[PDB]
Amino acid sequence: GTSKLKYVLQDARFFLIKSNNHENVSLAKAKGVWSTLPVNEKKLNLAFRSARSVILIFSVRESGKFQGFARLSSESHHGGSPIHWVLPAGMSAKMLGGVFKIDWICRRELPFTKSAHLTNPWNEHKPVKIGRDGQEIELECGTQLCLLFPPDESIDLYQVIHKM
């Protein structure tokens, strides 16, 4: 069903996450973590305290798809086991911010061809696929985008609801 998902998404905030490679998204799906540059780390920490759910919607650059979405379960923290992210040419692990814990809500892909009717008011009403890493997605657009993904029957949202 979609009812528990709608409950998790009620009054949530949404952020577009752009990764240069599939390796980082696969790591995030396996380990339940994300890290971003400090400018975006600060925004996500503010958002985490402000709303009952903060949703990250992931897209690998040049893939033509989103790769899933997850909910922040923590603010960023430093000093864990170093995650072996593949950073793009010119980027070093020192340039990253802290580590956020995330709970995946959907690990399934959605092609951009399916979201062409959704525009993001916070990015000049451009199609929601368009945006820099960290672009916030307005509530209605983000809710409808998450509802377009195929259901991920491997995930039980009962375990996310209790953290809210």
Ligand X SMILES: CNC(=O)[C@H]1CCNC1
Q: Which residues bind ligand X (CB under 6 A)?
A: 18-19, 24, 35-37, 85, 133
18 is in an annotated binding site: yes
Answer yes or no: are the C-beta atoms of 40 and 134 closer than 8 Å.
Answer: yes
73 is in an annotated binding site: no
| Of residues 66 and 143, the one with the C-beta less far from ligand X | 66
* Residue type present at position 135: Q
Answer yes or no: are the C-beta atoms of 135 and 59 closer than 8 Å.
Answer: no
103 is in an annotated binding site: no
| Of residues 63 and 144, the one with the C-beta less far from ligand X | 63
Rounded least distance, CB 87 to ligand X, Å: 6
**Angle, vertex CA 100, rays to CA 70 and CA 93, nearest 5:** 120
Rounded least distance, CB 43 to ligand X, Å: 13
| Of residues 37 and 161, the one with the C-beta less far from ligand X | 37
133 is in an annotated binding site: yes
- For tokens 């069903």, name the residue: 1
76 is in an annotated binding site: no
Rounded least distance, CB 4 to ligand X, Å: 28
Rounded least distance, CB 86 to ligand X, Å: 8
Element (H, E) at 71: strand 68-72
- For tokens 């509530």, name the residue: 139
98 vs 112: CA distance, rounded Å: 30
* Coil, helix or strand at residue 78: coil
* Residue type present at position 21: N
Q: Which residues are annotated as a binding site for RNA?
A: 18-20, 34-35, 85, 133
Q: Which residues are annotated as a binding site?
A: 18-20, 34-35, 85, 133
